[PDB]
Amino acid sequence: GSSGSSGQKKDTSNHFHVFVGDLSPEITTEDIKAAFAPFGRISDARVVKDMATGKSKGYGFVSFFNKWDAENAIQQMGGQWLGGRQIRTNWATRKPPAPKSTYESNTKQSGPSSG
């Protein structure tokens, strides 16, 4: 059959992670997995919980194997209702762009030598 395994790396590096918030107080990890299921194949997914009481933090995270899945969800899901309340979605992590670019030739040399 056609090769290519689903995910042979325990680390979530080649995946597209998505931030999720505004979740209801009962919304579990399975609620999120169900909600984002029709948008793509999920691997990592959880409901953030407070480290002092162990109760719902309000936010969660999801991670899709392909970009197109995550992109679709961020746009569409960001305004939909889950558990009877709205939710908020965006990219879990990003990187800022560079300011500007130019070119130069200042780094000249000669090196009158042989061997």
Instruction: Tell me the CA end-to-end span of the chain in Å, nearest whole number.
Output: 58
Tell me the CA distances in angstroms from 8 to 14, 64, 104, one per residue in order. 11, 15, 45
- Phi–psi pair at 20, nearest 5 degrees: -140, 135
Judge whether 36 and 16 are in contact, CB under 8 Å: no
60 in Cβ contact with 47 (< 8 Å)? yes
Task: Give kind and range of the element (H or E) at residue 89.
Answer: strand 88-91
Question: Counting Cβ atoms within 10 Å, is residue 33 exposed (0-12), middle (13-18) or buried (19+)?
Answer: middle
Name the phi and psi angles at 28, rounded to 5.
-95, 180
Residue 112 falls in which region: left (phi positive, over 0), alpha (psi -120 to 50) or beta: beta
Q: Which CATH class is domain 14-96?
A: alpha beta
Measured distance CA(38)–CA(36) in Å, rounded: 6
Experimental method: NMR
Cβ of 96: how many Cβ atoms within 10 Å? 5
